[PDB]
Each structure stands twice: as C-alpha cells, then as structure tokens.
Amino acid sequence: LGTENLYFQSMPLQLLEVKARGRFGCVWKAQLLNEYVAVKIFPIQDKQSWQNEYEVYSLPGMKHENILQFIGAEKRGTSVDVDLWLITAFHEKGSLSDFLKANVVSWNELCHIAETMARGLAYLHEDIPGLKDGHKPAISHRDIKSKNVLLKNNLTACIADFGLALKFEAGKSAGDTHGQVGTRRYMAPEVLEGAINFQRDAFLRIDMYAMGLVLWELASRCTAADGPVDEYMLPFEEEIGQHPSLEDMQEVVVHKKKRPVLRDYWQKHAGMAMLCETIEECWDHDAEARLSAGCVGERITQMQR
Numbered sequence: 001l002g003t004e005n006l007y008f009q010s011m012p013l014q015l016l017e018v019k020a021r022g023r024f025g026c027v028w029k030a031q032l033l034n035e036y037v038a039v040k041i042f043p044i045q046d047k048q049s050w051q052n053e054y055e056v057y058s059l060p061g062m063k064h065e066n067i068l069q070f071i072g073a074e075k076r077g078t079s080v081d082v083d084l085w086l087i088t089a090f091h092e093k094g095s096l097s098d099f100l101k102a103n104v105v106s107w108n109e110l111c112h113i114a115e116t117m118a119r120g121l122a123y124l125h126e127d128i129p130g131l132k133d134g135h136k137p138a139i140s141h142r143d144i145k146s147k148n149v150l151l152k153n154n155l156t157a158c159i160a161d162f163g164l165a166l167k168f169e170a171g172k173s174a175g176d177t178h179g180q181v182g183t184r185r186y187m188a189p190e191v192l193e194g195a196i197n198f199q200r201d202a203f204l205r206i207d208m209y210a211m212g213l214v215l216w217e218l219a220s221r222c223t224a225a226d227g228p229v230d231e232y233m234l235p236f237e238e239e240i241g242q243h244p245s246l247e248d249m250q251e252v253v254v255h256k257k258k259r260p261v262l263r264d265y266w267q268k269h270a271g272m273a274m275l276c277e278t279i280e281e282c283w284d285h286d287a288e289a290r291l292s293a294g295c296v297g298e299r300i301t302q303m304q305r
C-alpha cells in the first residue's frame with residue numbers, strides 16, 4: 001500500500017524497519033532505489049556525533065572493503081523540526097555481537113573475521129600520503145567493540161560507527177573530543193583511571209585494548225577449543241553483568257587487574273594458542289606493551305600457519 005517515498009539526492013527511498021539502537025541514533029534498514037541501505041537517524045541534540053562521523057567519512061581514503069561503506073549524509077526537515085541522516089551500506093548478518101550470539105565459529109571462520117577486522121582497524125590507524133583525494137591521517141576509533149563490527153555475507157568484517165573517531169595531524173596536538181567517551185566495558189584501564197592529555201599513540205593503544213576484548217569474544221565461541229563452547233557473553237559480563245557502572249568497571253579492570261578468562265583448554269590447538277597470546281598482549285595493563293594494529297594482523301597471518 002506504499003506508493004509514497006522519501007527522497008535522498010533525488011532518489012526514492014522507503015524505510016523498512018528499525019534494526020539497531022546506536023549510541024547516537026537509531027539505524028533503519030531501508031531501500032534506496034533497488035538496493036537495501038542503512039539510514040542512521042540522529043536527533044538534533046546529537047549533531048556533534050553526526051558531524052564527527054560525516055567528517056571522518058569525508059577524510060581522504062575512507063573507502064575500503066573493511067570500513068563500512070559511506071553513501072551520504074544530510075540534515076533533514078524544517079529548521080523547526082530537524083533530523084540528521086547518515087546513510088551507509090546495509091549488512092543483513094548484522095554485527096559480530098549479533099552473530100556470535102546466534103552462532104559458534106569454526107577456526108577458519110574465526111581467522112577470516114579476525115583477519116578482515118584487523119585489516120580494517122590497521123588501515124584506519126594508518127597515515128597515508130599521496131591519495132588522489134588527499135592525505136589520509138591516522139584515525140582512532142574510540143569505541144571498538146563487537147557491536148561496531150559488521151559482517152558481510154561471507155563473514156568479511158568492516159568497522160562501523162565513527163561518531164567518536166578522532167583524526168591526528170602530525171603537526172598538531174590531538175583535537176577536542178568534546179567530553180564524549182566509548183563503551184565502559186571495553187574501556188582500557190588508563191581511560192577508566194581518568195587519565196588525560198592522551199596523544200595519538202595513546203589513543204591507538206586504547207583501540208587495541210578494546211580489540212583484544214573483541215578477539216576474546218571470537219575465541220570464546222570457537223569450536224577449535226578442546227572442550228565445549230559456552231553461551232555467548234559480552235567481555236566482563238560474567239563478572240559485572242549486562243549493565244555495569246563506571247565504578248564497577250574501575251574495580252574489575254583497574255583495581256583487580258582482571259581480564260576475560262582465556263581457558264587453558266582453548267589452547268590445545270596451536271593457532272588458538274597463538275590467538276590467546278595475541279589477545280593477552282593486546283589487553284596488557286601497560287599501554288606501551290600492547291601490539292599495534294599492524295602487529296595483530298601479522299599475528300593472525302602467523303596463526304593461519
């Protein structure tokens with residue numbers, strides 16, 4: 001009964017269903033022309049995050065198999081009644097979190113998700129001069145988690161949601177983050193302590209800590225374990241549940257120095273053993289001790305052998 005369309009850049013669009021709840025907007029599955037897309041709608045009060053994500057996607061070189069594909073962004077409506085839209089590709093399998101909740105992964109499936117994920121993060125982190133669109137800066141994501149990794153039909157991963165992302169220009173100090181912070185559960189101990197004056201490398205190391213946790217999520221659901229695979233739980237859920245306070249997290253991560261358990265039986269398999277070692281180095285309390293994104297990709301290659 002739907003002959004009426006919305007229009008985006010003169011093209012017809014129909015909203016289907018709200019599929020996800022962002023930190024900062026709701027995400028709709030929609031049809032634009034003859035393809036499905038995602039329309040992320042932010043209220044006007046979250047203009048800063050919309051603007052940030054738009055700016056990040058506007059940087060040179062921000063098209064890559066392992067970065068969620070940008071389509072466009074626009075302010076909508078009347079200056080009285082405003083919404084902000086950001087349109088990306090749509091991925092029907094959803095986030096790595098959604099998938100791991102419904103499925104176990106084989107070793108080969110895990111390796112593919114991890115390799116593609118680590119490739120996207122490493123690209124995001126890389127400063128690359130000489131692109132046709134300009135000079136790509138290093139970009140920290142600042143909210144790495146399984147819910148921000150989307151899977152394609154073949155389980156290829158891409159990094160999504162750049163509302164908190166921060167670029168670095170090699171002749172300037174790290175710009176203003178406007179008081180906004182990532183998901184508590186995935187926060188590095190230095191972030192939880194309330195440390196300040198973070199600069200580029202500190203921000204990258206914060207991403208790599210969160211990445212360790214995502215890599216644990218995969219490990220935790222992999223059938224290469226020499227024993228049973230438990231039901232999916234978020235990092236730290238076993239210890240502090242689904243809805244932790246900042247103080248809950250400080251206690252578990254900062255004061256007790258605990259991490260999600262890497263079970264010894266997971267490490268019979270040579271590869272899983274290297275995976276667990278890699279995870280441990282990613283989430284080290286010492287930020288300086290943590291692997292780079294490029295190093296993690298090296299390890300995942302080494303792992304596949």
Ligand SMILES: c1cc(-c2cnn3cc(-c4ccc(OCCN5CCCCC5)cc4)cnc23)ccn1
Pocket residue numbers: 019020027038040068088089090091092093094095098150160161
């Ligand atoms: C963040 C995310 C996105 C985004 C792009 N695609 N996309 C897809 C989803 C999503 C899609 C499907 C979801 O359903 C749950 C899993 N289903 C269950 C039924 C069988 C298929 C898999 C849940 C979430 C969420 N967000 C996005 C766009 C912009 N910013």
